[PDB]
């Protein structure tokens, strides 16, 4: 089936953490397809069902496991299996919701949730902003946990949207962002939970019209430049591909 | 049966305005897990009121802790693991803060003010703040 990367919380490291994102980072883009030096999700165009997604086991030290199914093309969640279960966000169309159907093929219960997975739903659903909702090696095994118990009844919406706003940022956005990667081991490595500042969100925002930037820039140089906030919410601009070299691991197909 | 566990609360009784009390959630032996692997949760009831959190602890090895507005600056929710044990310090009583309180836990759990996050509750017991 599809390739599965294991993780679990339980005596998590930095380096645990370093070589589960560096290995979820080689099994989304194998071909070495590279633009401008960063490397390119593959394009969702005639891409065979087999390599469109790619399966995160994860587990905690109470022994509890779910698994994160993360679509290639974007490198998001799309949903999770828990043992008995299975449940997905909304498909943006037809295209994306004959896909999930080989997910999890093996479980007993299917369910597509009603709304979607991005940021705007889910924090409206949280009742919170991803400002407030703080990270870490702990926030994370409440996540699995949260997860795990959803199918059985024991977890109400605003903490499986909570929970799903941790994985998505811990694992996609840090897939996606070595800085975000980064950002994530600080709170590991003391073991000390903190919601993400304005320079990470503005980030996670702007993947999109990064991925676009670089793709389409004239020799690196972009067309136009892309506003992002510093830790204290101040502006600034990035008008090259040079300067997020270190900044960005992955982008989304274009052109 | 993993995850079963049996919870015997107690510390209660009787004080005067300005008190304090000290509860006690003792998770039974032969429990599979022990109580470290579990989030405790501390919530009272009223005879008209639902249950309403307090205090909670994570499961999480950071030890997380939620304190509702009303309890703030005077519980505090701490862990004896040798003695298979969770504390909650009641300081400054007031007669508002009279009613059943109960413990509850849940497995890998996340610090919680929501009675249906928790799956295994204590008795009970009474607290009553009077002179």
């Known amino acids: 089936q599809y390739p599965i990367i294991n993780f679990t919380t339980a005596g998590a490291t930095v380096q645990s953490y370093t070589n589960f994102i560096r290995a979820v980072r080689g099994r989304l883009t194998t071909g070495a397809d590279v633009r401008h030096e960063i490397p390119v999700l593959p394009n969702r165009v005639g891409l065979p069902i087999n390599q469109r997604f790619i399966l995160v086991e994860l587990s905690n030290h109470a022994e509890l496991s779910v698994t994160l199914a993360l679509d290639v093309t974007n490198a998001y969640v799309v949903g999770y299996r828990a043992g008995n279960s299975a449940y997905f966000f909304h498909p943006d169309n037809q295209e994306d919701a004959e896909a999930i159907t080989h997910l999890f093929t093996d479980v007993q219960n299917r369910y597509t949730f009603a709304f979607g997975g991005n940021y705007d739903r889910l924090e409206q659903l949280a009742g919170n902003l991803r400002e407030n909702i703080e990270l870490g090696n702990g926030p994370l095994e409440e996540a699995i946990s949260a997860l795990y118990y959803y199918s059985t009844g024991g977890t109400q919406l605003p903490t499986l949207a909570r929970s799903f706003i941790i994985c998505i940022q811990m694992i996609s956005e840090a897939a996606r962002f070595q800085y975000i990667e980064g950002e994530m081991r600080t709170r590991i490595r003391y073991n000390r939970r903190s919601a993400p500042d304005p320079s990470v969100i503005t980030l996670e925002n702007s993947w999109g019209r990064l991925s676009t930037a670089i793709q389409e820039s004239n020799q690196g140089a972009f067309a136009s430049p892309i506003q992002l906030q510093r830790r204290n919410g101040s502006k600034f601009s990035v008008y090259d591909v040079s300067i997020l070299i270190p900044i960005i691991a992955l982008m989304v197909y274009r052109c | 049966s993993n995850a079963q566990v049996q919870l015997v609360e107690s510390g209660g009784g009787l004080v005067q305005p300005g008190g304090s009390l000290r509860l006690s959630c003792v998770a039974s032996?032969?429990?599979?897990?022990?109580?470290?692997?579990?989030?405790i949760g501390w919530f009272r009831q009223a005879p008209g009121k639902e249950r309403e959190g307090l205090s909670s602890?994570?499961?999480?090895?950071?030890?997380?802790?939620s304190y509702s507005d009303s309890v703030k600056g005077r519980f505090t929710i701490s862990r004896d693991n040798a003695k298979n044990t969770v504390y909650l310090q009641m300081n400054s009583l007031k007669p508002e803060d009279t009613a059943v309180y109960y413990c509850?836990?849940?497995?890998?759990?996340?610090?919680?003010?929501?009675?249906?996050?928790?799956?295994?509750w204590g008795q009970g017991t009474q607290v009553t703040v009077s002179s």
């Open positions: 032996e032969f429990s599979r897990f022990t109580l470290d692997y579990y989030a």
């Open positions: 509850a836990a849940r497995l890998g759990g996340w610090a919680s003010f929501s009675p249906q996050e928790y799956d295994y």
């Open positions: 602890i994570s499961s999480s090895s950071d030890g997380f802790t």
